[PDB]
């Protein structure tokens, strides 16, 4: 039949040591008594056990010649059995409730009390403990400094990659590291399944741990056990016990993949209160149990010994970074006090964005004014006004406008970079097309990538086809996206700033009429944009010399040079942009005459647009709207709830300098 082998592990002494540790441990008295007491009062919902506590307790008790074996090693070599032992030990020593309980809400306990008041009145079934349990058992991996405290190599941890895990690690406790890409929804799963027995005394119970379940047909009720049936047993949803279930997969990082290889994947299961503790697109290090899963679910009658494997989550560190929604704290309050004491700030912020690229202060100032936003939140009668600024960058190849775009995208949490094709699921369609395993065809219809309060950045703005160009024509001026294909009208409220970088298809500027170059795009789209800035490469010794010296000094140090002098830091301005957006100044009336006469002189300029050769000086009311928005932004970025005429003057100078690059 089954031959037997001898192992140096016997569970009785281990269980006794577990009970002794759980009762006697001193880190308030015993921690493990206080937490169990809070569990008894229906306050706590999960149990976490620190293996470092067990290790240090055993190490300090080894000073007396009583201990004989180690338990953390057995935990590492096997975990699920010790989970069962821990829950048995906890249920054995569960304390009394020292607090009052709202006892009427526990419908499961009310039902069980009714069942008992039935059965024991006639003088009863021993219900399994897992049905009555309310807590969850979780583990916590050791810490490397704790291992260094002693000579022994009780290490664990060591966040192996997905591909570095091999077949002999099954059953142990391991830690993985990677990026989360897919997270499924929350779905309830059964733990104990109960059947009602049609008034035939006790209601038969059943317990299943496999992923496949089979129901009952006949019951052991005494009158049902009689020679003829008494009612057909039915499954009752109220009496049974459930548990939240969620599954995800994790991808290997691009750093850890050996050259010439494709990254692998790893499924992960999470149950209990840890559900919804992770989101797609973050770097984490999960600790859990590596378990096998039968291949019989596919039901091919093949793979006689081949089986699938998955990880069971126990503890996760979210890692990465936190945006925190600029939650107010004292430290950042003194930081903004320092910024206020710093005086004029916008020039420093412009200097501090991209020191790698030399000069180009106007574009950095424009980006800073863009990061705050223009006037928004509507006007009287409901007329639409959009606070996002639409600026386009013109320049020949080799000006590092793409590098500056990458810098602004990295430093802005809402930035997104797109381009003409290359990837198809980025424009005119959502990312949930034909995604679910059921091919449920989840879709919103007409939508873009994070178009709400986003910063869309595009390189080669002349490259994309008619579809994306029509998409931009739909997004013009915060207009909603209303493209329908199958009766759907779930429009996405697009409110985003537009960042466009492109070049004339000749790749260089020309002495002839400048609108002939423009963007090789319709003029209607061009008139939409708020600020047009041209970067023309002019061969000059006194400027190219400085540019070359700066670039070679950057290269020589293999780091950012000390040649730059920026008191501000990228995270510093990351906090300050949110701080300045929070202040939100409102408009003032005394500038209406000034802006009206400025618009009159702009129309005077339009009277001379036929002079040609830089014909971009055309007539548009959106020019007045844009100058108003830019004055609002020039009041927003640094000033308090006040709009100054100097803001209008600075906006006018910005417009003039933007036109000046034409020559």
């Amino acid at each position: 039949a089954l031959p037997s082998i001898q192992l140096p592990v016997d569970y009785n002494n281990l269980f006794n040591e577990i009970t002794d540790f759980l009762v006697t441990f001193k880190q308030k008295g015993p921690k493990y008594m206080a937490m169990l007491q809070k569990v008894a009062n229906r306050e706590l919902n999960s149990v976490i056990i620190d293996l470092d506590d067990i290790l240090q307790y055993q190490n300090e008790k080894f000073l007396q010649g009583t201990q004989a074996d180690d338990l953390v090693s057995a935990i590492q070599q096997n975990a699920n059995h010790f989970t069962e032992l821990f829950c048995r030990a906890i249920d054995n020593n569960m304390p009394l409730p020292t607090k009052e309980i709202d006892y009427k809400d526990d419908v499961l306990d009310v039902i069980l009390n009714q069942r008992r008041l039935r059965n024991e009145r006639m003088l009863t079934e021993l219900f399994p403990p897992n049905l009555t349990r309310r807590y969850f058992l979780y583990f916590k991996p050791l810490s490397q400094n704790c291992a260094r405290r002693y000579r022994k190599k009780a290490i664990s941890s060591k966040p192996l990659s997905v591909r570095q895990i091999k077949g002999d690690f099954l059953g142990q406790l391991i830690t993985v590291r990677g990026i989360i890409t897919r997270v499924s929804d929350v779905k309830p799963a059964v733990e104990v399944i109960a059947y009602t027995c049609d008034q035939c005394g006790y209601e038969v119970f059943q317990e299943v741990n496999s992923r496949t379940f089979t129901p009952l047909s006949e019951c052991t009720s005494e009158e049902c056990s009689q020679n003829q049936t008494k009612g057909q047993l039915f499954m009752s949803t109220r009496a049974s016990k459930f548990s939240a279930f969620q599954e995800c997969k994790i991808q290997e990082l691009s750093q850890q993949v050996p050259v010439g290889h494709i990254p692998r994947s790893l499924n992960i299961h999470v149950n209990g209160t840890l559900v919804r503790s992770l989101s797609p697109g973050d770097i984490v290090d999960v600790t859990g149990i590596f378990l096998p899963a039968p291949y019989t679910g596919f039901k091919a009658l093949k793979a006689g010994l081949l089986t699938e494997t998955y990880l069971e989550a126990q503890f996760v560190r979210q890692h990465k970074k936190k945006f925190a929604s600029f939650s107010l704290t004292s430290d950042v309050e003194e930081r903004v006090m320092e910024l206020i004491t710093s005086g004029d700030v916008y020039n420093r912020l412009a200097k501090s964005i991209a020191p790698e690229i030399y000069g180009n202060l106007d574009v950095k100032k424009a980006l800073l004014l863009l990061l705050v936003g223009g006037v928004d939140k509507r006007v009287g009668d409901g007329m639409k006004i959009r606070g996002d600024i639409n600026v386009c960058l013109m320049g020949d190849p080799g000006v590092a406008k793409s590098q500056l775009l990458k810098a602004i995208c990295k430093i802005s949490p809402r930035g997104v970079y797109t381009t003409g094709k290359g990837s198809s699921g980025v424009g005119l369609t959502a990312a949930v097309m034909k995604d679910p395993v059921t091919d449920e065809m989840i879709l919103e219809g007409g939508a873009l990538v994070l178009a709400d309060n986003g910063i869309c950045c595009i390189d080669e703005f002349d490259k994309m086809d008619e579809s994306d160009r029509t998409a931009i024509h739909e997004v013009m001026e915060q207009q909603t996206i209303s493209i329908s294909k199958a009766g759907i009208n779930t429009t996405l409220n697009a409110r985003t700033s537009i960042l466009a970088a492109a070049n004339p298809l000749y790749g260089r500027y020309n002495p002839r009429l400048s609108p002939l170059d423009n963007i090789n795009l319709p003029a209607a789209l061009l008139s939409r944009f708020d600020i047009l800035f041209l970067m023309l490469d002019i061969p000059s010794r006194d400027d190219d010399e400085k540019l070359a010296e700066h670039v070679t000094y950057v290269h020589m140090h293999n780091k950012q040079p000390d040649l730059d002098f920026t008191p501000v830091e990228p995270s510093k301005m990351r906090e300050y942009i949110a701080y300045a957006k929070t202040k939100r100044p409102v408009m003032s009336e005394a500038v209406n005459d000034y802006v009206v006469q400025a618009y009159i002189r702009l129309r005077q300029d339009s009277k001379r647009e036929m002079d040609s050769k830089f014909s971009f000086g055309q007539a548009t009311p959106r020019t007045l709207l844009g100058i108003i928005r830019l004055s609002q932004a020039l009041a927003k970025l640094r000033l308090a709830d006040m709009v100054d005429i100097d803001d209008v003057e600075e906006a006018l100078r910005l417009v003039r300098v933007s036109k000046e690059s034409l020559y």
């Binding site: 779905k187 309830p188 799963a189 496949t212 379940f213 459930f242 007329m383 919103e444 779930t490």
Partner: protein
Amino acid sequence: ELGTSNLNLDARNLLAYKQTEDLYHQLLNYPQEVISIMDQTIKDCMVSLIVDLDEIETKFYKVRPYNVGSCKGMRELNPNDIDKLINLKGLVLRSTPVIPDMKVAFFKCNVCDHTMAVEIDRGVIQEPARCERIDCNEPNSMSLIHNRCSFADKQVIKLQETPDFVPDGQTPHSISLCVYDELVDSCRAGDRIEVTGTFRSIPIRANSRQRVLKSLYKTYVDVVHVKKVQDLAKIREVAAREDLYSLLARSIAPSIYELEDVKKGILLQLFGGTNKTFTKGGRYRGDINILLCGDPSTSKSQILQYVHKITPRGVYTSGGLTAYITRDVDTKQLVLESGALVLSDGGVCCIDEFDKMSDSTRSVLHEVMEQQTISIAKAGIITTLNARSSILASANPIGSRYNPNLPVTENIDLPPPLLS
């Protein structure tokens, strides 16, 4: 005095009383039994209050409780809330045809042509193994009759969460819905509704050949409540005013400065002419079509939006617009779908960016104005459809400006007959 059978019941008024809040909590825990006993109580209360007894024995009584709790989303639904009342807001994605539901079986002893009616419970039917007539008493002579039974109309509604619950560009989630009787067809595609009902879970059959069941249960919500999100005397008082024309013209566009004549024309074409179909001569067009041209600095799209939302029926499109045979996505069938122009029968069809109209669709317009009837001959389907719609379009000149010296035809780039 009305004869209907319908009750509305708010929870807050139900909450205001001290004895009733206990019934409130018990309703939260046990919906079905409380609702059933409440309906029985109302059935008794009708007779207790009338003291014609004939209209009561035919009708039933049901309640429609609402506002039990705050609206919860699909992103936070713990398994602890199974078999409890919750409120949901969402947008309807798709409906389904009525699904007959078995309620009463009809059997027949084919040997002796004897029939009996059998009730069912929980869907499962206990088949009788022998005919009740002991005179024949044969076991295998009992056969079911499908079309002589009684049925109920079940319908499944697909619901999506409102977009306000997704702050960080995630994807929405879909929750299935179930309705009964008067709730059938109460919602259509694109409707924004709020519902009140209990939660439910059900096992999945997996393989239909065996009795194996998956460890995961599908979740769906059964609801009992839905909500969405002599004036002629006043007319003639206004109709007697002398300067009603100017005020009515200027009321359509409150923010547009000047442009009075175009506003008058647009209002008058919104009023529309007459239509007549005298036999010996044929029908005459009653629609009015207007075109707008100018540089893109006139806010001419704002007037398009104004007329689109003011008019009773109208479709606002851009530069496909007519009927075409389509392949149904979710179901592998073939469905005929009507276009935007057909959908604007009797209203105003709004067209924006009329210059970039391609070339294949323009002829379609050349067909729809001079005859107002479009035909299609594809996939073996030959038919004619009525449009009878008004057109109002906007166009832009070629170049940054419209030069007054050049005539209109060159700048707009439209065929002379279509403009004519």
